[PDB]
Design a protein around this ligand. Structure first.
Ligand SMILES: COc1ccccc1[C@@H](NS(=O)(=O)c1ccc2[nH]c(=O)ccc2c1)C(=O)N(CC(=O)O)Cc1cccs1
Lengths: 697, 14
């Protein structure tokens, strides 16, 4: 009877909804035994195989469905989703556009198409396609939530209050109905969800990994219980997709080579191929062992490799970010598995034992936000390679074009040597700051900037225009190499005023919300002449910020945007600001380290989530407790005092300039030593027969 | 930035 195959197919759909994927596969396949030319069953089966990570087998069954039924729009759209996951973006687009051509009223295909535009940087078209999807299917949580993030990205705050209400309502309903939430874990920090909901979102996303490893039917691994096979050395494995030109390497690329080889054996497992940068060269050369798991796409075979290396502590540096293979941690090839540095939040997952953090970022009273046990670094868990990558910013000089420390700035590895040749430099006490008077050399430097010249030569020294680094040395621009020339950086290069206070924030615009811009407006209104210096990320968000600001009483000329710059220029131009205003909703993490390395004080208000408390952890390690606000009033008052009491500003900027060197904040050698002490507490605890517990010392 | 999730469609047999 035709009822037979139909009943099996429709029952399987129910089992899929309930999360019973294995039974759904069983039913789909029985349907195909009963009715071999069953297009719907081929496509539905392919959809659950995709969910199990069997992407080629899924593609085979999609193509079968379409061979049977050439106008089967469901199969085209589902197949597009599989090609998108295989990184075949053009193939995905061709499938989505064919599905919509077949059925213009196909809401799911419009939404899946929108996700391609979103990921491609075409946010206006993503918004248009998500809005078509919601018009066709008004109850559509994936489309609604991904539209909400598009609007977050461009700072469109139209009906933002009602938007947050519905987002929370959607998540509440999906969690209650045991479904995967449509908000991604890495985005949940941006919305007013409870901590329980954020951890539950994370746990549900981690459960997707289980569906992909269960099909491997691998038994549990036997784990080492001593250090005998490793000559007393603890074997640490760092797993990352980001050994290459990516901010995580800009933070920790020095740490593998700084481990003590008498007590530790370091294994780096790359989840990405070699991008040819010095970042990848350095870790490959400095780790005791480097393993390219991008050549081993099966998570079962890759986990076998980790286990065969005898890893004691395996470190997850991705969490829920691009490039992750958390399936490797779900298989538990190591007895101790810790989250570290790359992902600002909990995995929510049973297969992670620890999250490496600190008492400022994650005070014990908020342990319930995390599924992991807390493992405290003694100062901050954050670290940066700035001292190794940007030593040319350790010193600076200025030109006295009239004395300011941040209107016309020179930096250079050989800057002192250059200044020895100029007998008329003045040394100002505030280290010390040399001041070049308005002489012939200074006029030539100023003329280079105004004329837009690339570089000039004075007394044999190359003097470079800071806007032209990629034409001079592309590897210096990326941070792969230390710049060799003396670089000139000026407020005129960025359209900043020479006679007023500059407040900067160089974060993605999606970290700003209405509450934050209101607080910044309050500050600018209390500091005459001051401006706010923001990042075009993306540019299409600029007119939204300007409209909301002008609506809050700020003329347009009070807000100055700059394009995204190469890594080195981005850190170097932080020296032109007077003060950095950190985003309370989700702090600057890498960019907080960047402004502090330039000597620019950062004002912050720590929240409750991990991501909202990192900047205050950094400032505590640095030793500037006066930059940490307990509430919005304090945040505004601190920023206004820095912008109006210029003697106080000089004092605080001098503190940052000095303590970026003397504090532990950028000291990678000390960090590695402290990290090693923490690993050994974890190991001794385990070796004594104990399950993970808080390591808050 | 991570890949934006997509929505699979389940086809009902009728
Ligand atoms: C979350 O950050 C990832 C993630 C994946 C890849 C790259 C990055 C980033 N690498 S990074 O953090 O070191 C870095 C570099 C230059 C930069 N130049 C500037 O002028 C301002 C910031 C900045 C930051 C990155 O380059 N971008 C810009 C892009 O994608 O075009 C994303 C951003 C993060 C904060 C602000 S904008």
């Amino acid at each position: 009877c035709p009822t037979h195959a139909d009943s099996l197919n429709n029952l399987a759909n129910i089992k899929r909804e309930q999360g019973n994927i294995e039974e759904a596969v069983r039913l789909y396949r029985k349907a195909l035994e009963v009715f071999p030319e069953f297009a719907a069953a081929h496509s539905n089966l392919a959809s659950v195989l995709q969910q199990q990570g069997k992407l080629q087998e899924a593609l085979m069954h999609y193509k079968e469905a379409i061979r049977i039924s050439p106008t089967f729009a469901d199969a085209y759209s589902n197949m597009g989703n599989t090609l998108k996951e295989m990184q075949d973006v053009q193939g995905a687009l061709q499938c989505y556009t064919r599905a919509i051509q077949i059925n213009p009223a196909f809401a799911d295909a419009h939404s899946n198409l929108a996700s391609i535009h979103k990921d491609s940087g075409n946010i206006p078209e993503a918004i248009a396609s998500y809005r078509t999807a919601l018009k066709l299917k008004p109850d559509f949580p994936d489309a609604y939530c991904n539209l909400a993030h598009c609007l977050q990205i461009v700072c469109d705050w139209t009906d933002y209050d009602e938007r947050m209400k519905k987002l929370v309502s959607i998540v509440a309903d999906q969690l209650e109905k045991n479904r995967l939430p449509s908000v991604h874990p890495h985005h949940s920090m941006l919305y007013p969800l409870s901590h329980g909901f954020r951890k539950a979102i994370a746990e549900r996303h981690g459960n997707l990994c289980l569906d992909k490893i269960n099909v491997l039917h691998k038994p549990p691994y036997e784990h080492p219980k001593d250090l005998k096979l490793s000559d007393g050395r603890l074997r640490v494995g760092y797993v990352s997709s980001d050994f290459g030109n990516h901010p995580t390497s800009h933070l920790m690329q020095s740490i593998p080579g700084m481990h003590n080889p008498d007590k530790f054996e370091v294994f780096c497992y790359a989840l990405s191929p070699d991008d040819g940068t010095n970042f990848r060269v350095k870790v490959m050369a400095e780790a005791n062992h480097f393993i390219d798991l991008s050549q081993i796409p099966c998570n079962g075979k890759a986990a076998d490799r980790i286990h065969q290396d005898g890893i004691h502590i395996l470190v997850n540096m991705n969490g829920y970010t691009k490039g992750a293979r958390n399936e490797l941690f779900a298989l538990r090839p190591a007895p101790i598995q810790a989250m570290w540095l790359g992902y600002p939040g909990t995995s929510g997952a049973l297969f992670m034992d620890y999250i490496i953090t600190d008492q400022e970022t994650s005070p014990a009273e908020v342990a319930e936000q995390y599924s992991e046990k807390l493992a405290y670094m003694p100062h901050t868990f954050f670290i940066g390679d700035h001292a190794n990558m940007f030593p040319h910013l350790k010193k600076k000089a200025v030109i006295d074009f009239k004395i300011y420390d941040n209107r016309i700035v020179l930096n250079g590895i050989d800057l002192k040597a250059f200044l020895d040749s100029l007998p008329d430099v003045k040394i100002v006490k505030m280290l010390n700051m040399p001041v070049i008077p308005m002489n012939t050399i200074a006029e030539a430097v100023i003329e280079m900037i105004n004329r837009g010249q690339i570089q000039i030569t004075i007394n044999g020294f190359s003097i470079s225009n800071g806007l032209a680094t990629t034409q001079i040395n592309n590897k210096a621009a990326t941070g792969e190499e230390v710049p060799r020339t003396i670089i000139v950086t000026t407020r005129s290069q960025y359209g900043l005023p020479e006679d007023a206070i500059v407040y900067c924030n160089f974060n993605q615009l999606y970290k700003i919300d209405p509450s934050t811009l209101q607080m910044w407006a309050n500050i600018l209104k209390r500091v005459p002449n001051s401006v706010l210096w923001l990042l075009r990320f993306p540019a299409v968000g600029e007119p939204n910020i300007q409209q909301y600001a002008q609506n809050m009483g700020l003329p347009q000329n009070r807000i100055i945007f700059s394009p995204v710059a190469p890594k080195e220029e981005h850190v170097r131009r932080g020296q032109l600001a007077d003060v950095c205003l950190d985003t309370p909703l989700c702090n600057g993490h890498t960019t907080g380290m960047d402004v502090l390395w330039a000597g620019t004080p950062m004002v912050t208000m720590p929240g409750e989530t991990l991501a909202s408390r990192v900047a205050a952890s950094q400032l505590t390690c640095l030793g500037c407790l006066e930059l940490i606000a307990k509430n919005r009033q304090e945040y505004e008052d601190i920023a206004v005092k820095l912008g109006t009491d210029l003697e106080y500003l000089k004092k605080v900027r001098g503190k940052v300039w000095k303590q970026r060197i003397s504090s532990p904040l950028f000291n990678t050698k000390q960090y590695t030593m402290e990290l090693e002490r923490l690993y050994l507490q974890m190991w001794e605890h385990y070796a004594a027969g104990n399950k993970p517990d808080h390591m808050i010392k | 930035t991570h890949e934006t999730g997509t929505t699979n469609t389940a086809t009902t047999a009728t």
